[PDB]
Amino acid sequence: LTPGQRFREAVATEHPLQVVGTINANHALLAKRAGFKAIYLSGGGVAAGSLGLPDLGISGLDDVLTDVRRITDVCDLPLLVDVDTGFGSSAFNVARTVKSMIKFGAAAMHIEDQVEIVSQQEMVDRIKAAVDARSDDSFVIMARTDALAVEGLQAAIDRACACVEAGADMIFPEAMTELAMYKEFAAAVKVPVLANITEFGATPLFTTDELASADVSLVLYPLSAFRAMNKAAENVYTAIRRDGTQKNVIDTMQTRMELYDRIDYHSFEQKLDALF
Amino acid sequence: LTPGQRFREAVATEHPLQVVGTINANHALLAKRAGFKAIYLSGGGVAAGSLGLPDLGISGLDDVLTDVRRITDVCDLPLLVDVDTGFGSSAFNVARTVKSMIKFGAAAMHIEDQVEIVSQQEMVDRIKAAVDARSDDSFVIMARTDALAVEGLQAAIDRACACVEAGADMIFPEAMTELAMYKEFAAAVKVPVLANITEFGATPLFTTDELASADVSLVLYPLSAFRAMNKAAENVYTAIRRDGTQKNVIDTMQTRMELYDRIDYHSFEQKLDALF
Amino acid sequence: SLTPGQRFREAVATEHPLQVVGTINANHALLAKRAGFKAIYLSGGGVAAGSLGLPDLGISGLDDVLTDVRRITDVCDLPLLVDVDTGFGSSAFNVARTVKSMIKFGAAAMHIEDQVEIVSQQEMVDRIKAAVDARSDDSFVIMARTDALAVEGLQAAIDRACACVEAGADMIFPEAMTELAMYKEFAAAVKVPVLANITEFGATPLFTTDELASADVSLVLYPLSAFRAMNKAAENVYTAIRRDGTQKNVIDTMQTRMELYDRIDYHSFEQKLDALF
Amino acid sequence: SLTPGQRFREAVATEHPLQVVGTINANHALLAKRAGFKAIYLSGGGVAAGSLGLPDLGISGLDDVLTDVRRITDVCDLPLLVDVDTGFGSSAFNVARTVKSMIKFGAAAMHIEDQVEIVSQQEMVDRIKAAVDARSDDSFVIMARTDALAVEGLQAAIDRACACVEAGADMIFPEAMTELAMYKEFAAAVKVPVLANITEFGATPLFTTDELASADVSLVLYPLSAFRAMNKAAENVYTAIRRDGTQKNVIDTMQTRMELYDRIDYHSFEQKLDALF
């Protein structure tokens, strides 16, 4: 199966499909072990995690592709990737973004209508450029829109329907925080709708049964693991500096034997034995 | 000050100098906020964290330099980098490693005598190659040796002294589990000695006071933060998969407002206002 | 819809012998396609000497080669045969990472050699086994390169090649074969496609496609030919500009702006924008 | 111990006008150094057309340019002037990452232009400020490139360039200037070093270093000259190989193996091994 076919199958056999943010290759394998069928590379996470920078469009296609290659080299779970507005203003930038994502093994990407949003026709043109560049039809193009917040619910439906007509496979409406609105949105746009359930934001922490009842097809936890990983890491640095040892924070650590297990150290031994 | 100058000064103004592993640029900034004067890029961390791979020499110079550039682009703490045996068998491979580490902003590297170890003359020739390629004399070349485990303490002192005569600035003896052995090693070798205080290994979790009494000049916590980060992330994946929400692991998460503070989001707005 | 390896196998099946030309960069891959070639090559000595300005002494790594592979295959659909030295590391895992990366970054084929003086037939077979096992797309071609002829003689080179074929090598690249009759004996014995490396200024005669076909050779490689001419031409420009204080005396040696626009298909970009918008 | 930027400023101070030659790759950087040039150039059109096989339509990005900067500056110590188009993104932060990345990867200087038609004088001044503020090494040269002459006329060009200088621009690259008398007037008004772009097959005449010295021009750029000769030579080889079934008829166009070993100083690697061991 192509990465994109895997993503489509995940969406078809889980309702709603849970998609978790994976900050690096290691966390992709943890996500697979935990039983998730799809994973996500947050653009905010590439910026804040990989580059230690704010999510202010400093991160480029190269930064994101590095993380895609590292994750898809070891993890076979379909990866949804945040590509912002396509990494440049031209249809040719959007095409290079699409073709590079497919080549480096990403299963899906979401592209947004940020410039404030562009006009419905500019967003349709962005989607047409991505659909036209696609060398593998199974690769999923998800249209992300901030139209609800800027122009209202009917504006967001009309824009999403125009994106679907242009070839968008799935819709990511931003700032949608009422289950009734998700349900009305899903009935109108017909294709799979993603609910972004991030923490410390506008949205209620809706559950999978709640989202399924509102006919939502995917639910995204874009930075959840990362936020816990930073608190845990900061506790270790503070403890080492204060105590002059890590001994008082040993209880918060993955063991050496857990790590060997989670990167499948044994399968490497097994490979050499089978070969020689 | 060159990164190398900062590393030398850190060792001169802290006894022993605490050097913490930083798996990514984000955690480099966390370590700086916690008050550490020096940080580390573990080669086992690039493998296990960045590539999701065992530490079996699959990770190469390019994988490591990508992590070096990401960290030194945003964090000004001197970075000590694990370069295995120099990423190739030639003096020219060791030379390209050295020059690339200096160019991409690393302050120090450690290079080891792994092939079982190489002859004392082979290790000396590796040090000479690295020392000859150094375009900036302040960049620290740290000789790492498994000679105590293979040939006993007197061999380990002889080899280390031979590395210092070849131009090695500092010494990283592997698997030293008695403060008395450190104390003796330090007086015999004369140059700064690093103690590798990793978890779940042979070494006791010695304190800064203990190591200062044994004349140890640097103490390394290579993966401490990483191991806590992975347990925290696995907890979040488990909870989300079990509960159909992240509701029950919110209390383990760095807040949005903390993330913004730790990647200094507000100095970006400040530069904008200060510039235009 | 063919994979790069299917394109490579199909080129070998439809041209006898198949001319494979070294392409130092994406621009020259496009020149080779326009000249009518069905396959191109990424020389390791060309990554070293051209892309890095370095001698071919194993300083160039997987990352360096992959960058050129990605630049070429992103714009040129011709199957790319790639020199991967000994696999960029001593471990079966290094060989596996090289094979998977070459497939992912769009190479059609790779050649891996028995250089450490050669390693034992067992070690070379182990290298091929590691490469064949790592292959995620069976259509990707693994070519075994061997210097056994010069080190151990013809029968040794034949035995090593057949062992490589038994380990799953698809095609064989013998080094230092200087006699046409030796290629014919070697091709009859090993059975799979044989590549003749017709580089310049080396031991090999400049054998023609007719001569190689008569010796049953399946591929003929011109690994650095365009690069060599490209460097003389460029040096003649630098010299002329430094000496004369102008490029006047080298204008006639240049590709025109209109030729370059044609060779990179500039106007097919404007047509795409019209087609779509 | 000179920084790249200091070497560039030293080259401009010691040669009038300073010849700056385009170098498509690290190999050609070493040829330019052998020919006696004191400064070299990474064309953004050359990264697109040569490294990527693409037209110069803003598809090439910071990563593509940095790879070529690193490859060249790793082996060639001549100061490299880099085309960074409009800074690779519309934010002052994009401009800042471009400046810091170019300094870290070993570039001596960059030109950044007022393309969006051009932006307003204030928006170009804001580009230069963003770049000047981001500079961690003040020896690194910021060159303002402007198409104001063609769009708004010479006085507009001078005022824009003077406002770029007040914002901290070290040097000026005026686009589409084709009269020696105009270079002289422009140079007199702006005061800082002015670069003449003497590309081929364009609107500019092939002005010589003496003519440009007489018009007070401080730098002369030959941005793609060597690349254009390299492409014609490489196409001649491909054409000959396809037509003849052999390279025999184009051997005389080729750099020899002995010349290639000389130009990448193969000897100095053997000498280094001897010295160390």
UniProtKB/TrEMBL annotation, chains A, B:
Q: Which GO terms describe its biological process?
A: propionate catabolic process, 2-methylcitrate cycle
Binding of Mg(2+), residues: D55, D82, D84
Q: Which GO terms describe its molecular function?
A: magnesium ion binding; methylisocitrate lyase activity
Q: Which residues bind pyruvate 2?
A: N93, R96
Residues annotated to bind substrate = S42, G43, G44, R144, E174, N196, I197, T198, R227, R256
* Chemical reaction(s) catalysed: (2S,3R)-3-hydroxybutane-1,2,3-tricarboxylate = pyruvate + succinate
Q: Which Pfam families match?
A: PEP_mutase (PF13714)
* EC assignment: 4.1.3.30
Query: Which pathway, metabolic or otherwise, does it act in?
Result: Organic acid metabolism; propanoate degradation
Residues holding pyruvate 1: S42, G43, G44, R144
- Identify the Gene3D superfamilies for this entry: Phosphoenolpyruvate-binding domains
User: What's the top EC group for this one?
Assistant: lyase
What cofactors does the UniProt entry give for this protein? Mg(2+)
SUPFAM superfamilies, A to Z: Phosphoenolpyruvate/pyruvate domain
Q: InterPro entries, from UniProt?
A: ICL/PEPM, Isocitrate_lyase_ph_CS, PrpB, Pyrv/PenolPyrv_kinase-like_dom, Pyrv_kinase-like_dom_sf
For this UniProt record, give its keywords in alphabetical order, as a comma-separated list.
Lyase, Magnesium, Metal-binding
* Protein origin, superkingdom: Bacteria
Its biological purpose: Involved in the catabolism of short chain fatty acids (SCFA) via the 2-methylcitrate cycle I (propionate degradation route). Catalyzes the thermodynamically favored C-C bond cleavage of (2R,3S)-2-methylisocitrate to yield pyruvate and succinate via an alpha-carboxy-carbanion intermediate.
Q: Please give the family membership noted in the entry.
A: Belongs to the isocitrate lyase/PEP mutase superfamily. Methylisocitrate lyase family.
Quaternary structure and partners: Homotetramer; dimer of dimers.
Which protein, by its recorded name, is this?
2-methylisocitrate lyase
**Species in which this protein is naturally found:** Pseudomonas aeruginosa (strain ATCC 15692 / DSM 22644 / CIP 104116 / JCM 14847 / LMG 12228 / 1C / PRS 101 / PAO1)
TrEMBL record, chains C, D:
> Pfam families given for it?
PEP_mutase
Give the protein family.
Belongs to the isocitrate lyase/PEP mutase superfamily. Methylisocitrate lyase family.
According to its UniProt record, in which pathway does this protein act? Organic acid metabolism; propanoate degradation
Question: Which organism was this protein described from?
Answer: Pseudomonas aeruginosa (strain ATCC 15692 / DSM 22644 / CIP 104116 / JCM 14847 / LMG 12228 / 1C / PRS 101 / PAO1)
Tell me the GO molecular function terms.
magnesium ion binding; methylisocitrate lyase activity
Which residues of the sequence carry a binding annotation for pyruvate 2?
A: N94, R97
PANTHER family per UniProt: CARBOXYVINYL-CARBOXYPHOSPHONATE PHOSPHORYLMUTASE, CHLOROPLASTIC (PTHR42905:SF5), PHOSPHOENOLPYRUVATE CARBOXYLASE (PTHR42905)
- Catalysed reaction(s)? (2S,3R)-3-hydroxybutane-1,2,3-tricarboxylate = pyruvate + succinate
CDD domains linked: ICL_PEPM
Q: Report quaternary structure and partners.
A: Homotetramer; dimer of dimers.
PROSITE patterns, sorted = ISOCITRATE_LYASE
- Summarize where Mg(2+) binds, as residue positions: D56, D83, D85
Q: What is its EC number?
A: 4.1.3.30
Q: Where does pyruvate 1 bind?
A: S43, G44, G45, R145
Which NCBIfam families does the protein's record reference? PRK11320.1 (NF008455), prpB (TIGR02317)
- For this entry, the protein name equals 2-methylisocitrate lyase
Q: Which UniProt keywords apply?
A: Lyase, Magnesium, Metal-binding
